[PDB]
Amino acid sequence: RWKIIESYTFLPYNEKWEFPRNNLQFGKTLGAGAFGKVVEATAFGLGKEDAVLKVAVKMLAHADEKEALMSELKIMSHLGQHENIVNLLGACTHGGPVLVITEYCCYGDLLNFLRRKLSSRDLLHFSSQVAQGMAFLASKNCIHRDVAARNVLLTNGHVAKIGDFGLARDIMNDSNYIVKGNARLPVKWMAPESIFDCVYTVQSDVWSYGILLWEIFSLGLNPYPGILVNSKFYKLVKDGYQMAQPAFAPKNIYSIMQACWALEPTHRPTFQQICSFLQE
Numbered sequence: 001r002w003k004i005i006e007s008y009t010f011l012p013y014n015e016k017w018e019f020p021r022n023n024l025q026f027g028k029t030l031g032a033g034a035f036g037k038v039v040e041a042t043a044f045g046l047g048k049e050d051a052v053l054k055v056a057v058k059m060l061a062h063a064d065e066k067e068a069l070m071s072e073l074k075i076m077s078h079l080g081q082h083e084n085i086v087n088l089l090g091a092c093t094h095g096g097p098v099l100v101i102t103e104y105c106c107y108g109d110l111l112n113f114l115r116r117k118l119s120s121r122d123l124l125h126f127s128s129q130v131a132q133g134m135a136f137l138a139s140k141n142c143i144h145r146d147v148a149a150r151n152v153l154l155t156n157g158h159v160a161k162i163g164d165f166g167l168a169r170d171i172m173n174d175s176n177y178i179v180k181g182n183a184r185l186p187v188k189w190m191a192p193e194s195i196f197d198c199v200y201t202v203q204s205d206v207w208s209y210g211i212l213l214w215e216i217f218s219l220g221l222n223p224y225p226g227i228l229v230n231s232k233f234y235k236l237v238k239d240g241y242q243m244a245q246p247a248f249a250p251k252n253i254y255s256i257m258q259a260c261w262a263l264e265p266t267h268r269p270t271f272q273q274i275c276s277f278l279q280e
């Protein structure tokens, strides 16, 4: 999951976020997992706004699991709002199981959407909005660690936000998640230093961000097409193999991909720089 690294960093729950669970009628299950699901719902009056906005609710495994949902909610209250990010609206932590309420994204995940099918204006759009999201997480020294297309959601306007299905994601049955000890990690999206040296930074998320780019401009090809994950693979990234340019990337964008896939973390760009190169 997404952790807070050491701009400048300075975590108990704030009861301001609290919401009467009494004002929620659930809908269809939007996704489900090894310890959790996520569901359509409607919220009867959150904020003097006093709306009836449609929302997603996450929910739960023993107290080993409780811990991490609260920690999740903690993190999401430390960061505060941003438009290209899935925003915490509220929570119900009393009178029942923990419920975490977030914004809703009608069009769902970017990977399925890209497969279901849109212009190279729209890819530049998607690419720029997610860049705005990570740049925001980066600025709070928040790392994500599963930056992939499947975890980009499309909301009102087909506008992109980064979230994380996390608990509500069937990792166990997803072959994009290889085994490694207790954990199961998205190896094809990981910077080398994370695979080999278990080190994870903002600059690590940049590696993953370059993969997202390869997805976006392949319209949802699984990365390293046909290449299995085993002895040969790890060597190729240690050697410094790189995916070829995808079909619909203007060469400019492929250079962005290659920047991100620099081996020494300290020579990859930042989300701000990426954000700024997309301004032009």
Ligand SMILES: Cc1nc(NC(=O)NC(=O)C(C)(C)C)ccc1Oc1ccnc(-c2cnn(C)c2)c1
Pocket: 002, 030, 031, 038, 056, 058, 076, 085, 086, 087, 088, 102, 103, 104, 105, 106, 107, 108, 109, 137, 142, 144, 153, 162, 163, 164, 165
């Ligand atoms: C995906 C997803 N992510 C998050 N993540 C989250 O809060 N993240 C963060 O805080 C970080 C710091 C990692 C950015 C939370 C919930 C969630 O669940 C949704 C949300 C909206 N919409 C659908 C949905 C699914 N299908 N449809 C049609 C809508 C599913």
Ligand SMILES: [Cl-]
Pocket: 094, 095, 096
């Ligand atoms: Cl109680």
Ligand SMILES: [Cl-]
Pocket: 083, 084, 129, 132, 159
């Ligand atoms: Cl935007």
Ligand SMILES: [Cl-]
Pocket: 222
């Ligand atoms: Cl796939």
Ligand SMILES: [Cl-]
Pocket: 249, 250, 251
């Ligand atoms: Cl070109």
Ligand code: NA
Pocket: 171, 172, 173, 174, 175, 176, 177, 178, 184
């Ligand atoms: Na798996």
